Amino acid sequence: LAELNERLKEENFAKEQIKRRFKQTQNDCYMTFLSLLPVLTEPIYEALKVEEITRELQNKRFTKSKTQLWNELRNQSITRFLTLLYCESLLIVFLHLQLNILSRRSYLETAIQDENLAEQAFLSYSWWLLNKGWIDIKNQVESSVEDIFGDINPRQELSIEEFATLINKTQQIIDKQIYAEKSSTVITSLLPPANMELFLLQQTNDMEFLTNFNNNIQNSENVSKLLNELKGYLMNDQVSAIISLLVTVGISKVLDNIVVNLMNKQIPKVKLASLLASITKQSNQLTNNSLDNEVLYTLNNLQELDDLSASVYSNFDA
C-alpha cells in the first residue's frame, strides 16, 4: 500500500512531466514559426511584385498594355495571397512534426553530443522551404489561379460568397496537385532529395559542426531515421487534410475581416479589383510575426493540429 502509493506518485509525476513537456513543445513550435516567418515572407514578396504592377498602372493613367498589366495584377495578387497561406501552413505542420518527434525522443532518453548533433541537423531542414521549396508551391498556385481566375474581368462585380467559392475552387485544384504522388510536391518542397542532405547542412551549419558530424557516420544514419519518420507523416492523408484546413481557416479569417470593413464603410457585390486590393492588405496581416497576430495564433492552435502533434509525440513505436 505505501509502496503502491509511492509508485502512483512516480506515475503521476511522469504524466505531469509528459504533459508539461508537450505543452511547452507546442508553444516552442508557435515561437519558432514566428521567428522564421520573415525569412519566408521576404522571398515571396520580392517574387510577386503586386505593388510594382500597381505603380506601373497608375503611371499609365496620367511597356505592357493596360490590359496586360491588369491581368498580371489579378493573377499575382491572388497567387501571392495563396502562396503565403500554403507556405505558412506547410511551415506550421513541418515544425509541429519536427519538434514533436524530437521532444518524444528526448523524453524517452530521460525516462531511460552525437545525439544532439543529429537533432541540430534535423532542425536545419527548415531552410529548404525557405530557400527553394516555396517556389514549387508558388508555381503550383500560379497555375491553379490561372485555371480559375484567368478569364475573369477585374471589372466584374462579385459577392463575397461568389469570391469565396472561386478561392475554394482554386484551393481544391492546388490540393489535388500538391498531394498527388509523382513523393508529393509537399515532400519535395519541405525536404531536399537524398543527394542534397549534406549540402543543406553545409548551407546551414559551420565547419566545426560538420567536422564533428562527419566524424561518426552514425550521425548521418540518425538524421536519415528522423527524416524517414517525418516523410512518413508528410505522405499521410490526415496530414494533408490538416494543411488544407490551415489554409481554409486562414482564408476564412481574412474574408471575415474584409466583410467587416465593408459593412463598417457603409453586402453589395464589389468589383474583382476591389477584392484584389483587399486581399493584398489582408495578406500583409498574415506576414506579421507579432505575438498579437490572432490569425497566426489561431492557425498554430487548431484542434486537428494538436491531435496530430499528440499522435506524433506519443508514437513510441516509430
Add this chain to the structure above:
Amino acid sequence: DDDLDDLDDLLDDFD
C-alpha cells in the same frame, strides 16, 4: 477599353 477606364479609380484602393 472603357471597362478599363472605370477600373482606373480602383488603383487607389491599393493604398
